[PDB]
Design a binder for this molecule. Structure first.
Ligand SMILES: O=C(Nc1cncc2ccccc12)[C@@H]1CCOc2cc(F)c(Cl)cc21
Ligand SMILES: O=C(Nc1cncc2ccccc12)[C@@H]1CCOc2cc(F)c(Cl)cc21
Lengths: 305, 300
């Protein structure tokens, strides 16, 4: 029993964290095979970030300008190139701890574990979701750039995020491992704002199923709804529309608990129109939206890595 | 910026997880140097659960009864001994991934990361606090016994918990790595109940400081209180009494935010009296008590 916000074991990713220093900037790099990936803004000083021409800044750099440190051993950079907002530093040593891995781009609503690092050293692991506005509500301090987000599928690490910056509201923005930003954000010191965030409806439904699995069932009601009527109500409370794909993904949880998706939708609908009435669900007074249906199945069944 | 429930990186502990099988029971073991630590209840049968005599059950066991598996390699048990409720299986191979480590017994209110494992394989990492009633509100399924709780302050792992059982209310009980249970619990299937749980007051205060550091101020007020008046109010809400030790530990956060401890105590009293009025603190509608003052300083 119990339901916790749970991250993937971080070991396979810790063995890849290095420190990348270029001039006065020090941040984190991800060492996989003979390549170290890090944010391209490491090549920027103060003036540069205001209006940066990364291609021109990188052409002025040499391999020796990049100081890469893996543990207490300095790696020698033998090549450098840029792929979108990520800088790829070719090194002369392949990481002996390189796990089986893939670079994946996730969609809003998807969750992942973040290994927050400082000076190439892992300091914490936490779970989060890619918000519908493409930000993450992370916990990052100065020096955390280059920290990565990942999922594990069997023994394969899927790297999906690399931390680049903190927006004025305290939320975070970054890219996939190919340097493409999640969201309408740029790696430049300029006025940027995240769009109005919405609630990940399919994830709230999955968490309501986790609560029923754990014996917390007061919010259940006799009612059901159409997907169209539910979406009309959901739009009014800044909840993402629920698609037939989402109803299908919730299928196993529906079968396990005996509560149809549209039956659970009518419970969520009443929760939005009337509140929790002084009650909690899984020890929470707010509806949690950072657990996907897969996360609920994984945690409530005990899948290992 | 931002404030998350954050666990320590689990890598140093994953390299220590092994599977321990005794007859029909399979659970997790912690392999450090040439010793595998696991709950002694792995040696129990069906009839030896209501009132097992562990000393007598262990004397009837031989090294070849214990099957230890580290990854896809079977380890050879060359000795066995018991220390309180923990079984110690001496093996013929020292774990090459043994990190710098210590065994520490924690106090209620202290937090730690849990690496939940099944069949010696890590499945998840989460952050927990030792409740004032000495249980943990974990997330554990059958087979999770032997999963450990730890903290990693620097490069040294302080193992503080090993999971033993789930109580009837769904909360969990276990021991330090010397086999001593946290709480008035025994590793028997006898009638056991956790005491009424209370809120870790010092941790809520630390989290209110984390919120101020992150730009939350709506809950602040112009009041201060005495420690005695605060304790009289807080205890009516099933909150733990706040001691002078707790006021002292909150000192650096008080200095950093410019809000005295007793000033923050008066904010907490008002939060308890009014509720949150539709507002949240650090994205939460309830007062969080699983962040210690040390966790807040470290994360912020
Ligand atoms: O965001 C930045 N680093 C931080 C990241 N995460 C968390 C933080 C918390 C506090 C202070 C910095 C934090 C850097 C420095 C500030 O300016 C920029 C601007 C940029 F366009 C980019 Cl791509 C990066 C940065
Ligand atoms: O609690 C137990 N293991 C579990 C742990 N955590 C989570 C669970 C979730 C579901 C089912 C078992 C779970 C075992 C089996 C049940 O009875 C006992 C009794 C005992 F005295 C001891 Cl020391 C252990 C156990």
């Amino acid at each position: 029993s119990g339901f916790r916000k749970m991250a993937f074991p971080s070991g396979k990713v810790e063995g890849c964290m290095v420190q990348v220093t270029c001039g006065t900037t020090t941040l984190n790099g991800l060492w996989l095979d003979d390549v170290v990936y890090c944010p391209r803004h490491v090549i920027c000083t103060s003036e540069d970030m205001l209006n940066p021409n990364y291609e021109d800044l990188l052409i002025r750099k040499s391999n020796h300008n990049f100081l890469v440190q893996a543990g207490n051993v300095q790696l020698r950079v033998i090549g450098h190139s840029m792929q979108n907002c990520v800088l790829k530093l070719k090194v002369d040593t392949a990481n002996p701890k390189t796990p089986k891995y893939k670079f994946v781009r996730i969609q809003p609503g998807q969750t992942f574990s973040v290994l927050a690092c400082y000076n190439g050293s892992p300091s914490g692991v936490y779970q989060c979701a890619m918000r519908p506005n493409f930000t993450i509500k992370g916990s990052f301090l100065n020096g955390s750039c280059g920290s990565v987000g990942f999922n594990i599928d069997y023994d394969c690490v899927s790297f999906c995020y690399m931390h680049h910056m903190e927006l004025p509201t305290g939320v975070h923005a970054g890219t996939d491992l190919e340097g493409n930003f999640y969201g309408p954000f740029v790696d430049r010191q300029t006025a940027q704002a995240a769009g109005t965030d919405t609630t990940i409806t399919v994830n709230v439904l999955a968490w309501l199923y986790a609560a029923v699995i754990n014996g917390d069932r007061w919010f259940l009601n006799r009612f059901t709804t159409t997907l169209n009527d539910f979406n009309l109500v959901a739009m009014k409370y800044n909840y993402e529309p629920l698609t037939q794909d989402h109803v299908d993904i919730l299928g196993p949880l529906s079968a396990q608990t005996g509560i149809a998706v549209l039956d659970m939708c009518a419970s969520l609908k009443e929760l939005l129109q009337n509140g929790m009435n002084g009650r909690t669900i899984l020890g929470s007074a707010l509806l949690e939206d950072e657990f996907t249906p897969f996360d609920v199945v994984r945690q409530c069944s005990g899948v290992t890595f």
